[PDB]
Design an enzyme around this catalytic site. Structure first.
Site, PDB file in Angstrom:
ATOM      1  N   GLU D  29       0.826  -1.200   0.000  1.00 21.09           N
ATOM      2  CA  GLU D  29       0.000   0.000   0.000  1.00 21.09           C
ATOM      3  C   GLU D  29       0.864   1.255   0.000  1.00 21.09           C
ATOM      4  O   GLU D  29       1.604   1.505   0.951  1.00 21.09           O
ATOM      5  CB  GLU D  29      -0.927   0.007   1.218  1.00 21.09           C
ATOM      6  CG  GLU D  29      -1.834   1.234   1.333  1.00 21.09           C
ATOM      7  CD  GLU D  29      -2.350   1.444   2.745  1.00 21.09           C
ATOM      8  OE1 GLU D  29      -2.410   0.460   3.511  1.00 21.09           O
ATOM      9  OE2 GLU D  29      -2.691   2.592   3.094  1.00 21.09           O
ATOM     10  N   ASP D 102      -1.297  -0.889   5.696  1.00 18.62           N
ATOM     11  CA  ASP D 102      -1.162  -0.235   6.997  1.00 18.62           C
ATOM     12  C   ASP D 102      -1.990  -0.964   8.054  1.00 18.62           C
ATOM     13  O   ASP D 102      -2.988  -1.611   7.734  1.00 18.62           O
ATOM     14  CB  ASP D 102      -1.608   1.235   6.943  1.00 18.62           C
ATOM     15  CG  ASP D 102      -0.725   2.101   6.058  1.00 18.62           C
ATOM     16  OD1 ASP D 102       0.322   1.616   5.575  1.00 18.62           O
ATOM     17  OD2 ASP D 102      -1.069   3.293   5.877  1.00 18.62           O
ATOM     18  N   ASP D 104      -3.792   0.473  10.139  1.00 21.43           N
ATOM     19  CA  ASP D 104      -5.001   1.265  10.354  1.00 21.43           C
ATOM     20  C   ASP D 104      -6.217   0.698   9.607  1.00 21.43           C
ATOM     21  O   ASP D 104      -6.108  -0.308   8.904  1.00 21.43           O
ATOM     22  CB  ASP D 104      -4.742   2.719   9.940  1.00 21.43           C
ATOM     23  CG  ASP D 104      -4.230   2.848   8.515  1.00 21.43           C
ATOM     24  OD1 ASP D 104      -4.724   2.138   7.614  1.00 21.43           O
ATOM     25  OD2 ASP D 104      -3.320   3.673   8.297  1.00 21.43           O
TER      26      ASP D 104
HETATM   27 MG   LIG Z   1      -2.598   4.594   6.501  1.00 18.43          MG
END
Ligand SMILES: [Mg+2]
Ligand SMILES: COc1c(N2CCN[C@@H](C)C2)c(F)cc2c(=O)c(C(=O)O)cn(C3CC3)c12
Ligand SMILES: COc1c(N2CCN[C@@H](C)C2)c(F)cc2c(=O)c(C(=O)O)cn(C3CC3)c12
Ligand SMILES: [Mg+2]
Ligand SMILES: [Mg+2]
Ligand SMILES: [Mg+2]
Lengths: 487, 247, 487, 245
Positions: D29, D102, D104
């Site tokens: 990513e 990530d 997150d």
């Molecule tokens: Mg991020």
DNA sequence: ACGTGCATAGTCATTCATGA
DNA sequence: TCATGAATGACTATGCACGT
């Protein structure tokens, strides 16, 4: 290597995303009407001192402060969010005072971060009023370094005033803006009739909040959709721009549009008419000319043919363009960490509750601090009454600790008070300064009495909300822009 | 003579005017996307058109012609002005009788001016000879009086003068907000640009004049040419006396 | 409308551009070896507290701070300049401690501003050492709000250490980096032999500065170009990478390149060879493979054919690639606002002069401050000797102005000193506390005498520069990287 | 064996090994993370394909539009295999496909979009266990004298901290524990020693048990029907914690 | 013709829900 | 298909001097 089933991964991951977007990105908190990014930008600027009492700071500094301390995301999109909060055609009551090129209602984009400056507006200062007096819960930021506020004091009903629009997961919000003076009347009623049930409250509040008040002015046609939105939490509100027919000495009637409905791009609007005329969908139109300027505002002149009726062309414009367009109201907001569609009486009540919480918490804080200073002042007065003795004691001490320990014994004092006596300057040993200490004690004891009275009486608490809000509205309230007409 | 303006074969960046009469039309060549954006808003769309230029303009003195004609910004200027270049120059096809160059007051604005003037002098000289080229002088300061209307200053001297006069007149300024200092056109909004550089009743324009063509030819070649040594000796020779050119 | 001749306009405008670019953009100040953007970045970070004694701040905050106060230009290019000052393959002695992805010696670009963090390095802290003690002239920034430094203290010869390259107008600079320990020896000599002429000084300094020391290691071939650069200010220094021939089990040979000369892009270098292979220019090569990694560093393996000689292929590589490439030295720097090509003894001497200025100014600052503290202390001591009267006086005064005015008359004291007596805490009236005031006076009077002595003796001044620099070098000095060989 | 680039995506930093059985593709990513990954990798067996932005939802988007998407083309082209009926696992250029996003929520979202692409276009990659999920670090404990330690959860952080202090080690209260908020904040070394070093990396192998049950879940979560998804979230988000209890 | 380093940002594609 | 609004930045071109 651990095995994981695709169904387990998909469900857990998507739910975690959906829930964060719902509660912590796309949808507004009902109490201050703010999304996380909004709250963090404003508090960053506030803490940085970018306030109306000083010159505009470079907007790059606000972005970097927000990015570095509170909002762990990109500088580009954060700047977009700050910019939008400064546009008078986006926010009914702008929270950011922008200096420079922040774009236009058309396709003219804002200037880059390097060119623009920004600071908080006076109303935004009311959002953050007395936030440093423990009026709201704080939590650690994304990395534990500093604290950030969970919600702002919001000393004016910002959610209803500025509205909100957001696309989340499984749901979306679209709350329109309202006139502050009308909202205040509703709040004033809710405070007076604090025991009224929901049925009465809804009827009362709907009587005072006549409808949405858009920053772009225009017209609201009908009353059904407005009533639905307040009664259901969902409703379709028909908006219209303003058209003024002008006649020429040659006989060339033309339509002058000076206002458009909320969130209609001026350039897209002109292009839509232009493309619908070239292909042949709006006959009767002869010529389209944009005579708009920074000095006359919006002014789109649509000259129509001689064998055409003005009203027919206007209805055709209502039909085939966004000169007439509907606002899809969906009163969705986060209530106590839960997304909820709310009636207008619920929105007002929840805000009033927040205000009362803020005032009680403020009073408790001030009362605690008042007691502390009073406590120290009581120590000082004891020192003044026996001033000759106080000095002689400190002189004979090898350290300051012996001097302190003696002061405790001499005057029956705490360690805090004795320390305060030690830190005392010779400045305050002058006549008027000694008297000033006495009077200061008398003053605080009076303030403490007032503060205790406030906590014991809900009546006063509600009174404070009313008076303080009233002061805000009188100063920052403006006339209605959107005109409400019948069918 | 009249020519059609674009409204929904000209540069995409061009925000043309509405007037079809070149004698009545003006082209503001602006430095930067922001400044051009604000100009597009504060202008009089009837007679004033905006052509924003991005970045430093290519040096037509150094670069070969084929490379110059491939440059997007040069193409925009040539196309917007309507006239050809060099031998194919035809002033009859001039789309604007006023070509206002508007750059930042800073040093990089000055540089863009010399690059534009070099383009004009080498490709479209008659525009300079017939007085169609002008230089806009942006404001440097904006005095924000507490009660009175704000005043703009185009030099440090004027700032001192207007400040002294106003104070002597009993006016007052905040020492915080106070005097806003402009560092570029991009920092200005639509209103400010109108009231200082585009309002024909208030704007300070300078008309570019061409006296000695042979002398001009030499100066352009020295300053803008490929010969570095010549340029170096010219600067070290004449920079000492740049102050005293108008004394 | 005012008329202006094109010749006046062209000449005035271009000269104004050329001169500012020369003096205030592209070329380094000889004293600290910094361009304006560099100096402004470092000072911004310094003032913001982004120092090695604290965790890395988001680099966006450094850019915005630089933009808002000192450097009125774009955030994009300012970030590039900051990034460069953190790359170990660009700067021989990095001034910025970068955290995150700051790119590579190849075509891999650095990460965006949002992803990275940054703070000053310990050596950069020596650039700014005691900048707050009036060691350098400050001027108002671009809008008069705040002050910025005209030059940094630069307590190590940064220009020669890190070098500089810049394209101006009518001229350009290209100074190579050098080894700190060698530069220090040269400085130590210049200090000891402060009366030596240029002829002797050049011979001495050239003996200690053996040549440039690049961060990318590699080789320097020959000694002529180095000698030219130091004696003329211009010279062509031949650089080479390091090649190590490896044999295979089959008996095939391969060339392993582990180092390249200064400012040679690794990816472009591999591509250049690759294109010069197909282009049938570098026969004898069989295969090119990049076996590089974060753990082994540069490692370009060049497998050659069986009917190929290693050195022949290596010589071809020197000839047709940047495996061997020359550094075009041009020792141009700004001296007293004037661009000047300098000999090596001039570069050292001008730096030594700057250091001596810094040490004298620091001493002057400290001496002034010491007198002030001494002055106030003398006032306090007078109060203590007549403490009974002083207190009685302040007590019997109706105001503090009356008390102050009285104190001057009582003890024959200044108003500043008298003010200090008033500001005195009751703490300082303790026995041991009274004694510290006496001792502090005795302490400071010793410090003042020392400082006066330093100013009176150039020997000590030079001694300080030597001793302080020696400490820096012992702490931050490193081994030579670039190896010097003969033809 | 298969040829590596030295007819594939421009963003692809291919490996050197000509053996798909030993080769690995790290789908990363962001440009930053992919950039550092390209440096910290083992260029012999590990290839990097950075993906930019949110991946297009193949459940919602029309087929032709998906094929126009630059990021999807990159994945399909890099994997070598076709899609749907023209899928041929024999041409699989990497027998290990590591998705690395990530920690997150937006990383999690990108995971679900990639897993949807794979399950709908290239299901056999999941069925034969060629798809994996890398677990990035969340914390880096920077001891004053000892080597730094990485933690993949809040619990592990507390544990390693507790143990280290008990062992007599010490940390700065300023620098202290660095918290990772994304792969883009990491450098090349950090990524190697936590997600790419095969002797330390924490991979999760995606398994597919009930295809019919999975098919329905994908359609509910990723489909165009909002009502179904809305009710599913309000029904099951309440119990997301207790899926592995 | 390419590298160098400090100066002069708009364009490009997706998720997501809803109504035209 | 398009707008909304917060989320997930690399690429593109000139000036300027100098050396291969
Ligand atoms: Mg991020
Ligand atoms: C590289 O991905 C982005 C794209 N595009 C570029 C072209 N390919 C598509 C896949 C993504 C974009 F068209 C805008 C943005 C942005 O506007 C943006 C921002 O911060 O505002 C960030 N990103 C990247 C992935 C994070 C953007
Ligand atoms: C718009 O002009 C720029 C261009 N280009 C874009 C298109 N072709 C030419 C006209 C300019 C560029 F390719 C890079 C930059 C930049 O990299 C940059 C920066 O901040 O670094 C600033 N600008 C604009 C004019 C200032 C740049
Ligand atoms: Mg964006
Ligand atoms: Mg400028
Ligand atoms: Mg750039």
């Amino acid at each position: 290597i651990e095995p994981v089933d695709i169904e387990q991964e998909m469900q857990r991951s998507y739910i975690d995303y959906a829930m964060s977007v719902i509660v912590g990105r796309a949808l507004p908190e009902v109490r201050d009407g703010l999304k996380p990014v909004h709250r963090r930008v404003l508090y960053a600027m506030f803490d940085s001192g970018f306030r109306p009492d000083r010159s505009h700071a470079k907007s790059a500094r606000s972005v970097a402060e927000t990015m570095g301390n509170y909002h762990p995301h990109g500088d580009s999109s954060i700047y977009d969010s700050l910019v939008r909060m400064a546009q008078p055609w986006s926010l009914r009551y702008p929270l950011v005072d922008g200096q420079g090129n922040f774009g236009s209602p058309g396709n003219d984009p804002p200037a880059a971060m390097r060119y623009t400056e920004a600071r908080l507006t006076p109303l935004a200062m009311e959002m953050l009023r007395e936030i440093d007096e423990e009026t709201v819960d704080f939590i650690p930021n994304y990395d534990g370094r500093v604290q950030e506020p969970t919600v702002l004091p919001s000393r004016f009903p910002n959610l209803l005033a500025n509205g909100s629009g957001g696309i989340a997961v499984g749901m979306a919000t679209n709350i329109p803006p309202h006139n502050l003076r009308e909202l205040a009347d509703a709040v004033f009623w809710a405070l007076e009739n604090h025991d009224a049930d929901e049925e009465e409250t809804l009827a009362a509040v709907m009587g005072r909040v006549k409808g949405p008040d858009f920053p772009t002015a225009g017209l609201i046609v009908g009353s059904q959709g407005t009533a639905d939105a307040y009664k259901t939490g969902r409703g379709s509100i028909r908006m219209r721009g303003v058209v003024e027919v002008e006649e020429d000495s040659r006989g060339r009637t033309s339509l002058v549009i000076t206002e458009l409905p909320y969130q209609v791009n001026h350039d897209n609007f002109i292009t839509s008419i232009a493309e619908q005329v070239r292909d042949g969908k709006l006959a009767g139109i002869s010529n389209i000319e944009d005579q708009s300027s920074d000095r006359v505002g919006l002014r789109i002149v649509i000259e129509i043919k001689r064998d055409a009726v003005a009203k027919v062309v206007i209805n055709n414009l209502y039909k085939h363009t966004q000169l007439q367009t509907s606002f899809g109201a969906n009163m969705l907001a986060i209530v106590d960490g839960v997304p909820r569609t709310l009636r207008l009486d619920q929105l007002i009540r929840y805000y009033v509750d927040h205000q009362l919480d803020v005032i009680v918490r403020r009073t408790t804080y001030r009362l605690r601090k008042a007691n502390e200073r009073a406590h120290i002042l009581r120590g000082l007065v004891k020192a003044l009454d026996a001033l000759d003795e106080v000095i002689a004691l400190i002189r004979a001490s090898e350290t300051v600790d012996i001097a302190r320990a003696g002061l405790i014994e001499l005057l029956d004092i705490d360690e805090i008070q004795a320390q305060a006596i030690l830190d005392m300057q010779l400045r305050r040993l002058a006549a008027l300064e000694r008297q000033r200490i006495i009077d200061d004690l008398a003053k605080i004891e009076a303030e403490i009495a007032d503060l205790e009275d406030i906590l014991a009486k809900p009546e006063r608490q509600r009174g404070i909300v009313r008076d303080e809000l009233a002061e805000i509205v009188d100063r920052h309230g403006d006339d209605r822009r959107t005109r409400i007409i019948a069918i | 003579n009249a020519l059609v303006r674009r409204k929904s074969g000209l540069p995409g960046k061009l925000a043309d005017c509405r007037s079809t009469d070149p004698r009545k039309s003006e082209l503001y060549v602006v430095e930067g996307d922001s400044a051009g954006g604000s100009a597009k808003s504060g202008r009089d769309s009837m007679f004033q058109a905006i052509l924003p230029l991005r970045g430093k303009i290519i040096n037509v003195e150094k670069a070969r012609i084929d490379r110059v004609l491939k440059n997007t910004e040069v193409q925009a200027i040539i196309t917007a002005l309507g006239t050809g270049i060099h031998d194919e120059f035809d002033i009859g096809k001039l789309r604007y009788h006023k070509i206002v160059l508007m750059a930042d007051a800073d040093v990089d604005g000055q540089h863009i001016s010399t690059l534009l003037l070099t383009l004009l002098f080498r490709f479209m000289r008659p525009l300079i000879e017939n007085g169609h080229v002008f230089l806009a002088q942006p404001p440097l300061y904006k005095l924000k009086w507490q009660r009175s209307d704000p005043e703009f200053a185009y030099s440090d001297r004027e700032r001192d003068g207007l400040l002294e006069a106003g104070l002597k007149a009993g006016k007052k300024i905040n020492k915080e907000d106070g005097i806003q200092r402009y560092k570029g056109l991009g920092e200005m909004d639509a209103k400010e640009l109108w009231e200082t550089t585009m309002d024909p009743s208030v704007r300070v324009l300078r008309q570019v004049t061409l006296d000695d063509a042979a002398a001009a030819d030499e100066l352009f070649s020295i300053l803008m040419g490929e010969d570095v040594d010549a340029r170096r000796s010219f600067i070290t020779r004449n920079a000492k006396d740049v102050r005293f050119l108008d004394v």
